């Protein structure tokens, strides 16, 4: 774990990594690999992170147990049908359904895959069979929050008296579905935690656009210049009612009777069989469908046709940690301006229109899809005549929006429609209240580029930089000094503490843990004694009486606390900025539970960071960025 | 299939994050000061409150200051392989070690032991005269095999060179 490994990911999905091409293979499991390795060793497959126990199943409700999975027969395919096929031609129709236990909201999602081939080849791997290499074990790619996950699972599915409890073909012999669904529920960590998910969800997961939907009962002005703009992009829209069908809007043109102008909508169901009582409809539809999604996305979906207009998109990330990222809420002009802030730049306009949705990561606390959600919500503001300068409090305390998502739901994504006079505007994504550890990720399907950015600031820090020599003493200080070592007349990182220690009667509070003087040292030891003469020593005290000043300035009582959020400010006093991440890590790795970060602390921090920085500094001496290093050279730096 | 004190551990977690399973720095600190501050054959106060930050931050991927249950019982154990060492180099009881023993648990937890390294060691972590009591000895090797790995990480296909921008940087150190 460690830091390392969020580090070391990045420069791998900085590569490619995640991306349709370099998905990543979640659990590490790799097919070629355990195929290969299973064909050769005469086995099918046996999926030791997601076994065909009952746990696999669910937990409470499909929960072991429990008689809704008690006894049990998870079959492969050819166990229980024969010369069963993976996935054969593209019907017209589907034949897709679910058993017993099965959920229902897998049976539109997939469906939908179905009769677009091409969506479907992003999904499941068109390159499997129950022939030429099988092995009991199949993948599929699946897009989450951002970037595709390779899962490979076998094929045991819960039977029940030859049955399939959950999603299956009426027609046996196809299983791609059944097992794509195995797939999910694994990625998902378990069966019954597909039990709810929207259609709007685990489709998004299937494809990567991006799921805006309507309530067909009270519906937007133009409700219909967007349908037609939707399939016109190659979107996917579906449809459902209080019946408990599914359908798709494979789409509407508004022909004219030229006396009338009878616009029409060309409704389809995925199953075949279509009948009724009206025309396509009378768009009386309005008041007979109940539902409506559609799917604008991902532009490397249709990786061809030149068919449908193509979305323009760029995506961030971003996370707010509790105590230092957190604000969240226009609400809290406490917190809000230290969200993470992006720039988006509009250039041409439309003949600019926008989609963005703040969808949230996942979360170790929940367990099945749409529970435990964090209220996210974002808001956007208006730049008036401006990147490397993080917001600060006075710019919303200042202006006070133009046009703010839509309220803030208790839900995974979340996207509004915006159309806007190509100026640039800023976001800030965030959560209800303050205060909530969480991740995140903000795409943005535009109609024309976009330059999305952030706004934050770069490492920079820059030190007053004294140069007395063994003078500029004052003398009245000079005098005040070796008197309190002895001999030697130097000071120790120890001699140093209570040196230090026995220096104070101000104002909790009690000098500085050892550590602190360890490092005080540490920042400023070049001839690598151990000790410190009056030079050093000086700039020391005076640096300490700058710091005292700051804390001092800002814990306005004798409390010898300060919030955690004052650091950001504080930091910058003390001449350091920096961009959201190491904040972070500067109050992870310094504040209290209750988010309170002591005097010593403070300045074990901002001596700390001088030192690694000069260090950086010094070793860069010709500013290249980098500073290359060898293990046991590493290992040094390292201890502290 | 985990052994019984890291059931009674694991429940200890639930108790506290409930199925967020997390514990933070404080939280640690405790439930790890009250396991090793038994047995009288060892002497020590405790973990103090920086020890068991760095045992947090270096386990932690997401940069929110807690431990997973899974991390804790990496770190748990490897702090296991270690309340023997120590354990058994002081046997003056006093809750330290010999300066000139101090080379030889550094070996008995396999090490290269560089000279320039050590030092850095025993400036860190021992006490004036030059003693490193429980506390510290473990918090080195926490932080130490952090480290080894964190370069082992970062070093994918195996030029023995790491290489970090800025940020990396003031990252890996100040993250520990």
């Known amino acids: ?640 | 299939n985990e052994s019984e004190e890291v059931r009674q551990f694991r429940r200890l977690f639930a108790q506290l994050a409930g199925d967020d399973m997390e514990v933070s720095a404080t939280e640690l600190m405790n439930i790890l000061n009250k396991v090793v501050t038994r047995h009288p054959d060892l002497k020590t106060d405790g973990f103090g409150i920086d020890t068991c930050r760095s045992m947090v931050a270096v386990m932690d991927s997401d940069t929110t200051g807690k431990l997973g249950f899974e991390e804790f019982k990496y770190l748990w154990n490897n702090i296991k392989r270690w309340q023997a060492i120590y354990k058994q180099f002081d046997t003056d009881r006093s809750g330290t070690i010999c300066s000139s023993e101090l080379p030889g648990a550094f070996e008995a937890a396999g090490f290269h032991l560089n000279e320039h390294l050590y030092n850095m060691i025993i400036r860190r972590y021992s006490d004036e005269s030059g003693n490193m009591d429980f506390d510290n000895f473990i918090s080195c090797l926490v932080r130490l095999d952090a480290m080894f790995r964190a370069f082992k990480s970062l070093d994918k296909d195996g030029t023995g060179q790491i290489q970090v921008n800025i940020q990396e940087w003031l990252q890996l150190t100040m993250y520990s």
Not at chain 1, 257 to 271: V, Y
């Open chain 1, 1 to 640: 774990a460690g830091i390392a490994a969020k580090l070391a990911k990045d420069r791998e999905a900085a590569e490619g990594l995640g991306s349709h091409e370099r998905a990543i293979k979640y659990l590490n499991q790799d097919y070629e690999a355990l195929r290969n390795e299973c064909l050769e060793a005469g086995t099918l497959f046996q999926d030791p992170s997601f076994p065909a126990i009952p746990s696999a199943l669910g937990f409470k409700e499909l929960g072991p147990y429990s008689s809704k999975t008690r006894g049990m027969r998870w079959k492969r395919p050819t166990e229980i049908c024969a010369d069963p096929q993976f996935i054969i031609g593209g019907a017209t129709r589907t034949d897709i359904c679910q058993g017993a236990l099965g959920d229902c909201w897998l049976l539109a999602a997939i469906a939908s895959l179905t009769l677009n081939e091409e969506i479907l080849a992003r999904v499941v791997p068109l390159n499997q069979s129950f022939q030429e290499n099988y092995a009991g074990i199949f993948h599929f790619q699946f897009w989450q929050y951002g970037e595709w996950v390779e899962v490979v699972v076998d094929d045991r599915l819960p039977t029940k008296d030859g049955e399939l409890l959950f999603v299956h073909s009426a027609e046996g012999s196809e299983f791609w579905s059944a097992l794509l669904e195995k797939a999910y529920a694994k990625i998902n960590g378990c069966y019954e935690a597909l039990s709810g998910g929207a259609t709007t969800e685990g489709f998004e997961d299937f494809t990567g656009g991006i799921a805006e939907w309507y309530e067909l009962k009270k519906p937007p002005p133009n409700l219909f210049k967007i349908i037609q703009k939707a399939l016109q992009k190659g979107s996917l829209l579906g449809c459902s009612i209080d019946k408990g069908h599914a359908y798709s809007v494979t789409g509407a043109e508004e022909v004219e009777s030229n006396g009338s102008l009878q616009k029409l909508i060309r409704i389809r169901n995925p199953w075949g069989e279509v009948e009724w009582t009206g025309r396509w409809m009378s768009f009386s539809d309005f008041l007979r469908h109940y539902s409506r999604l559609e799917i604008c996305n991902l532009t490397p979906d249709t990786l061809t046709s030149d068919t449908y207009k193509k979305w323009k998109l760029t995506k961030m990330d971003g996370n707010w940690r509790r105590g230092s990222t957190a604000g969240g809420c226009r609400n809290y002009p406490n917190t809000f301006w230290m969200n993470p802030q992006y720039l988006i730049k509009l250039e041409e306009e439309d003949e600019c229109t926008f989609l963005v949705g703040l969808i949230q990561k996942h979360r170790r606390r929940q367990r099945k899809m749409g529970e435990d959600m964090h209220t996210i919500g974002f808001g956007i503001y208006e730049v008036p005549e401006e990147t490397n300068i993080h917001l600060s409090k006075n710019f919303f305390l200042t202006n006070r929006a133009r046009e703010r998502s839509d309220t803030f739901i208790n839900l995974r994504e979340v996207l509004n429609r915006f159309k806007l006079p190509p100026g640039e505007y800023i976001l800030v994504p965030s959560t209800f209240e303050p205060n909530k550890d969480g991740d995140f990720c903000i795409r943005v399907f535009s109609e024309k580029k976009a330059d999305y950015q952030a706004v934050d600031d770069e490492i920079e820090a820059n030190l007053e930089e004294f140069d007395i020599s063994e003078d500029d003493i004052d003398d009245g200080v000079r005098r005040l000094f070796a008197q309190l070592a002895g001999e030697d007349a130097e000071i120790s990182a120890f001699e140093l503490q209570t040196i230090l220690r026995r220096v104070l009667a101000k104002r909790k509070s009690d000098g500085f843990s050892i550590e602190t003087c360890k490092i005080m040292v540490d920042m400023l030891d070049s001839d690598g004694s151990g000790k410190l003469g009056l030079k050093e020593f000086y700039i020391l005290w005076t640096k300490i009486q700058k710091y005292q000043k700051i804390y001092r300035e800002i814990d306005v009582d004798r409390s010898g606390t300060m919030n955690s959020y004052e650091m950001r400010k504080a930091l910058e006093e003390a001449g350091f900025k920096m961009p959201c991440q190491l904040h972070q890590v500067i109050v992870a790795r310094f504040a209290d539970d209750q988010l309170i970060i002591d005097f010593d602390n403070f300045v074990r921090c901002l001596v700390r960071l001088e030192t690694l920085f000069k260090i950086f500094k010094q070793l860069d001496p010709e500013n290249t960025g980098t500073i290359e290093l060898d293990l046991i050279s590493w290992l040094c730096f390292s201890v502290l």
